[PDB]
Amino acid sequence: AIEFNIQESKILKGVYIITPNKFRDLRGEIWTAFTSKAVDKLLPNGLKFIHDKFIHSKHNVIRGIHGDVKTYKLATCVYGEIHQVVVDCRKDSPTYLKYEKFIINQDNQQIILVPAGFGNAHYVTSESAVYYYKCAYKGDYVDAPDQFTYAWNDERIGIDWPTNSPILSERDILAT
Amino acid sequence: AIEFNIQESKILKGVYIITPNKFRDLRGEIWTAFTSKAVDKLLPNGLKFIHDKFIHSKHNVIRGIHGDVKTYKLATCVYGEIHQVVVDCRKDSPTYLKYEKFIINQDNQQIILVPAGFGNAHYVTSESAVYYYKCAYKGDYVDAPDQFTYAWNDERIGIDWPTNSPILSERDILATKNKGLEHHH
Ligand SMILES: Nc1nc2c(ncn2[C@@H]2O[C@H](COP(=O)(O)OP(=O)(O)O)[C@@H](O)[C@H]2O)c(=O)[nH]1
Ligand SMILES: Nc1nc2c(ncn2[C@@H]2O[C@H](COP(=O)(O)OP(=O)(O)O)[C@@H](O)[C@H]2O)c(=O)[nH]1
Ligand SMILES: [K+]
Ligand SMILES: [K+]
Ligand code: NA
Ligand code: NA
Fold first, then answer.
1. Phi, psi (deg, nearest 5) at residue B145
2. Contacts of A81 (CB under 8 A, 6+ apart)
3. Known catalytic residues of A?
4. Cβ A67 vs Cβ A118: under 8 Å
5. A35 exposed, middle or buried (CB, 10 Å; 0-12, 13-18, 19+)?
6. How far apart are CA B27 and CA B44, in angstroms?
7. CA B2 – CA A175 distance, rounded (Å)
8. End-to-end CA distance of chain A
9. Checking CA distances to B152, which of A135, B8, B162, B174 falls within 20 to 30 Å?
10. Is B7 an 8 Å CB contact of chain A?
11. Is A25 on the interface with B (CB under 8 A)?
């Protein structure tokens, strides 16, 4: 009765769209975001998710676009609603700076596998949102200084965002 | 840097209280709940966390007291506020039916390692709460039918809950009428 629907992106090869089922009742809802048996097989040989992170952001925050050459991510929204965006940031890739966007909320609980070399970003449409992502990497976590950054509104990517004036960090402004 | 403070409980042998650091700014906060390196080492050799669950509950929900002899859990609240309760349900333990309570919210981001053979429960004080817990087990996941349930209001445990009138499932109500039969499989 714990189930996953696992579909590969039609737009970006190697991006996976994972949808869990849920048990809903008078108290709320219960669901499984991840099992090693269901999801780690999607990663390359020798790699498993080993790191769980939470981001709680206020309305009209954008975070991104962030990535590095080794870190795989599995991302969703576990409270509120986001626009989740994946960008192919591999400079050798024929689909370099193509993107895909997912509107994620409790009724659309897509979970996105973001490969290494892809950029990751989200926008908060709700009053606030809690972003959940898992990381898979060998050796050390790649912190912000060693990551690449693209501007949320880079004209090459041309993302359709629901904001014309987001709340950003200095990193994400420097990128613009 | 990503940091953890890890303390064993002073009350219940085997329970760990894990506290992350957070980066806070104008946008909100970022934090790490788990790394294999930091936390999987607290489990038995050969066992790792391999399952992630979310429970979103409305105000005044209780869930519990649920447990099984194989499954280790790592639990916190990632939105809202709960009263998280661990019960030692190991019948051999000197602290059998003793409990520890943690009020968990964004300013008190404790993450509780609940060992196999313990009972797990929580109550939602906020308008709603999102409960996050990881599971570590060999073999198949232990679903509701193969778990034990202790009554939320069992007077041998004597949990100080903030209400006498929580919202409960049929499973958690039925436990209040089967005290003494928690182990029946
Ligand atoms: N789809 C799905 N169903 C689940 C999951 N976890 C539990 N259930 C089902 O949800 C119901 C309640 O399970 P239980 O563990 O009693 O929930 P609790 O009372 O919140 O601990 C049972 O029917 C379970 O089979 C899950 O992760 N996914
Ligand atoms: N304590 C802690 N700091 C973090 C974590 N992740 C990122 N940071 C720090 O938070 C700040 C912003 O990081 P960045 O990756 O730009 O955050 P983003 O803008 O949300 O992607 C940087 O100083 C990071 O070192 C974490 O999990 N825990
Ligand atoms: K793998
Ligand atoms: K271990
Ligand atoms: Na694989
Ligand atoms: Na160990």
1. -65, -20
2. A103, A104, A105, A124, A125, A126, A129
3. 66, 133
4. yes
5. middle
6. 39
7. 24
8. 46
9. B8
10. no
11. yes
Which amino acid does the sequence have at B140? D
Name the one residue in this structure whose structure tokens are 């925050």: A61
Rounded (10°) CA dihedral A107, A113, A117, A120? 20
DSSP H/E element including A130: strand A128-136
Does B167 touch chain A if contact means CB atoms closer than 8 Å? yes
Mutate to test the interface with A, among B27, B51, B142 (most CBs of A within 10 A): B27
Cis peptide before B173 (omega within 30 of 0): no
Method of determination used here:
X-ray
A158 secondary structure, DSSP code: -
Rounded to a whole number of angstroms, the distance from the CA of B23 to the nearest CA of chain A is: 10
Amino acid identity of residue B5, one-letter, is: N
Q: How far apart are CA B54 and CA A82, in angstroms?
A: 17
What tokens does A23 get? 């048990």
Round to whole Å and give the CA distance between B142 and B150: 16
CA dist A154 and A157 (Å) reads 6
- Tell me which H or E stretch contains B170: helix B170-175
The tokens of B132 are what? Answer: 């996050």
Return the domain boundaries, chain B.
Answer: 1-185
CA dist B42 and B151 (Å) reads: 29
DSSP string covering A32-79, please?
A: EEEEHHHHGGGSPTT----EEEEEEEETTBEEEEEE-SS-EEEEEEEE
Do A76 and A109 form a contact (C-beta atoms < 8 A)? yes
Q: In angstroms, what CA-CA distances link B177 with B61, B89, B119?
A: 19, 18, 18
Contact B2, B35 (CB under 8 A): yes
Listed in sequence order, the residues at least 6 apart from B173 whose beta carbon sits closer than 8 Å to its beta carbon are none
CA-CA distance, B174 to B149, in Å (whole number)? 9
- Tell me how far the alpha carbon of residue A43 lies from the centroid of ligand 5, in angstroms: 5
